[PDB]
Design a protein around this ligand. Structure first.
Ligand SMILES: [Mg+2]
Ligand SMILES: [Mg+2]
Length: 536
């Protein structure tokens, strides 16, 4: 059997993450100071007699600085007061911020707050074109709409063209903030990534900055980074002791990138165990993907798929030696999860992730059959298979394993493919397809998303990529709707799904496969989050 030639890049990190020794002296000092700063900041929030605009800017700044996870109760109480009092008597920048903050937190504030900023025709008054802070906040708000917000249909175009016009002549750091916003809006960005930029590039350089908030944000970010580095070291050692880098040379060596994914899903300390479980799953399923995509024969893939369905170590002998390596590693991993969850009596929930993995592999095999037969399915049939092969139903289910408060009813809800999960999956599917279209087309993949779309509807590549763009936009509106109260499960279990959608946007920014080619997109993010501390 002549296998295809290896074409992937090696890990660009080597062993620089393998050993990290925390400095307990520094960490304990940081934490001791943070406690003091945390309380000063709390008192800023609970301060009475604040104006609406000041209150919203405080909350907004604390969220962008990445320290709002300390104040979820206080921020919620305040936004709930604002929601229920109905203040319709403000300028564009306060109104747009009010809208965004409330919607992001699930409060269904009416989009009619914007009608006073539009003419009889529902288009924004062009007299607002000289209000840069108004335009910036309108811009950020435009990314949070649902299907019920067509009054905002013009907001993105309007704010974008006038921010571009104004940008070159703005003072710093406002100019940099506007320029950054036009490249990456806040709502669709990975939170740690946006936080790092905000602290270091914007707030640190604001003439008006609050010194207590800035120091708090820097210390907290650097302290959490220490934890992230310990987790990455622990995960790097686990990966090294599996040694797929040499026993399975056909596969992408990307455990750091996988960690960045898990860090994107949640960054907070209480999700430390959840992050480590998640990244191990991402790494492992990525090995299975490459086995199907760039190494295994049709016959070998069949045995592998069936062994996975039966899920039994007795089945290894049906497999070629190299497949025994991945298969035992997979079964062992899930036995590890089971033991790791035994202490809390949550072992039984592991079977939910296992059934989602079986689903991914069945659909991998189908995709392989299609490729060999040269089948180009209709879009409907294509998606019925290719949605699961994003792995996103599987990763979402996996993200719950290490979350201490996840109950069986939470898994029961997820298992029904609720709309917010379906939307996140769809976003990953159509963006990946738009980006990897050309590459897969050159490798003989006639069953690629865009191709199925072109053939089905009888339309050009351009028209099909536009249709996929529309599906992404529709899905973002569904994600935004799915955050609105009353939520079907706790918000804590929605945020990982939202964050998975965000990781897509960030990873495939400017239409490139950032996981396969980490050097362009992911490398600076990894350095900013996991190598370089913010200088105080
Ligand atoms: Mg694949
Ligand atoms: Mg693709």
């Amino acid at each position: 059997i002549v296998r295809p030639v290896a074409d992937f890049s090696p890990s660009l990190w080597g062993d620089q993450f393998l050993s990290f020794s925390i400095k307990n002296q520094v960490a304990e000092k940081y934490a001791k100071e943070i406690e003091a700063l945390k309380e000063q900041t709390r008192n800023m929030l609970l301060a009475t007699g604040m104006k609406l605009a000041d209150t919203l800017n405080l909350i907004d700044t604390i969220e962008r600085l990445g320290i709002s996870y300390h104040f979820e109760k206080e921020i919620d109480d305040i936004l709930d007061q604002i929601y229920n009092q109905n203040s319709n008597c403000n300028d564009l920048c306060t109104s747009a911020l009010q809208f965004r903050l409330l919607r992001q937190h699930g409060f269904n504030i009416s989009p009619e707050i914007f009608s006073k900023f539009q003419d009889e025709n529902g288009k924004f008054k062009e007299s607002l074109a000289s209000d840069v802070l108004g335009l910036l906040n309108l811009y950020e708000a435009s990314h949070v709409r649902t299907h019920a917000d067509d009054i905002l249909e013009d907001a993105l175009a309007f704010s974008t063209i006038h921010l571009e016009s104004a940008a070159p002549h703005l003072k710093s750091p406002l100019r940099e903030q506007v320029t950054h916003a036009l490249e990456q809006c806040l709502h669709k960005g990975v939170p740690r990534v946006e936080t790092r930029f905000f602290i270091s590039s914007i707030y640190d350089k604001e003439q008006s900055k609050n010194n207590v908030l800035l120091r708090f944000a820097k210390l907290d970010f650097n302290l959490l980074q220490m934890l992230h580095k310990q987790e990455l070291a622990q995960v790097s050692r686990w990966w090294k002791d599996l040694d797929f880098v040499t026993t399975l040379p056909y596969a992408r060596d990307r455990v750091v990138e996988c960690y960045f994914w898990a860090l994107g899903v949640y960054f907070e300390p209480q999700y430390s165990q959840a992050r480590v479980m998640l990244v191990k799953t991402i790494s492992m399923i990525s090995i299975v993907d490459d086995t199907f995509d760039a190494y295994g024969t049709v016959k070998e893939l069949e045995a592998y798929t069936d062994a996975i369905q039966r899920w039994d170590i007795n089945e290894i002998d049906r497999l070629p030696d190299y497949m025994k390596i991945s298969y035992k590693a997979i079964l062992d991993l899930y036995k590890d999860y089971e033991k790791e969850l035994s202490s809390a009596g949550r072992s039984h929930i592991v079977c939910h992730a296992i059934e989602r993995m079986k689903e991914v592999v069945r659909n991998y095999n189908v995709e392989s059959t299609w490729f060999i037969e040269g089948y180009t399915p209709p879009v409907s049939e294509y998606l019925s298979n290719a949605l699961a092969t994003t792995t996103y139903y599987y990763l979402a289910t996996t993200s719950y394993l290490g979350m201490k408060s996840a109950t069986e009813q939470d898994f029961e809800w997820l298992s029904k493919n609720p709309k917010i999960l379906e939307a996140s999956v769809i976003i990953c599917r159509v963006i990946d397809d738009t980006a990897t279209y050309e590459v897969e087309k050159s490798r003989g993949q006639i069953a690629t998303g865009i191709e199925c779309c072109m053939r089905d509807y009888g339309i050009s590549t351009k028209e099909a990529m536009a249709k996929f763009q529309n599906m992404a936009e529709t899905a973002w509106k569904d994600i935004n709707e799915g955050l609105l109260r009353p939520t079907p499960v706790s918000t804590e279990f929605l945020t990982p799904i939202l964050n998975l959608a965000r990781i897509v946007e960030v990873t495939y920014i400017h239409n490139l496969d950032g996981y396969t080619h980490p050097e362009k997109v992911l490398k600076p993010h990894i350095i900013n989050l996991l190598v370089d501390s913010i200088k105080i």
